[PDB]
Symmetry: C2
Subunit: 136 residues, 2 copies
């Protein structure tokens, strides 16, 4: 997975995901905002995903966010993941951004928010815990 | 989604999923056991899904289980979904089966267990709540 550290520094968003199944999951787009942690995009419309399920997307975003914000040693290990669907999705692109809440030496806690028009009224909010092997 | 009710009665497992992104998510297989609720299969090995993430799989299985066990009126709506990763996965095929716990008039509670060699020592267990429009 060395190519990762190589693709991060190169900001190769387009292909860094080309070879991960979240493009094979959706049409996720990916880039960075102003001083804000990594941000994701998905064309929430209908190539279609019925049921409006996004667990896979949310879960991988949280994983990617972690290894994008950390030492690309090995992929962190997920312990658990929870998701609440708050409101139906609209025919607008779906934005998502994660935040690392507590980050002890071996465990990182991630919060993922998915919204469209108002991040104050998110479409869904998720949370994930990962176990890390920080060589620190 | 009429074709669904048509594909259920026809037990067309192979293509019923051909047109849902959980084959585009993994190599999910699907069939039925003896008197036991629907059962799923995935070749848990590495076309690869690193991080061992399976949230998308688990979430869709629980959805599919619901509409397979219910009136194919419209797809049920998910409210929330939680997942715990209990043990690493082995180079064996991953089995998964859901069970409907409480099933009031408008809400169904689903439990999904994913295991390989011993369902007593599952790889992961999930839970999901759905809102239904049972015309009953």
């Amino acid at each position: 997975m060395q190519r990762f550290a190589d693709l991060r520094d190169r900001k190769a968003y387009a292909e860094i995901v080309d070879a991960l199944p979240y493009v094979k999951l959706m049409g996720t787009s990916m880039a960075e905002d102003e001083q804000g942690e990594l941000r994701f995009e998905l064309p929430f419309l209908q190539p279609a995903l019925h049921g409006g399920l996004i667990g896979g997307f949310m879960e991988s975003a949280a994983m990617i966010h972690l290894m994008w914000n950390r030492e690309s040693l090995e992929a962190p290990k997920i312990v658990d993941f929870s998701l609440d669907y708050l409101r139906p999705g609209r025919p607008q692109t779906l934005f998502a951004q994660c935040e690392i809440t507590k980050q002890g030496k071996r465990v990182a806690h991630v919060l993922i928010e998915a919204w469209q028009d108002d991040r104050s009224k998110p479409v869904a909010v998720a949370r994930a815990h990962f176990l890390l092997t920080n060589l620190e």
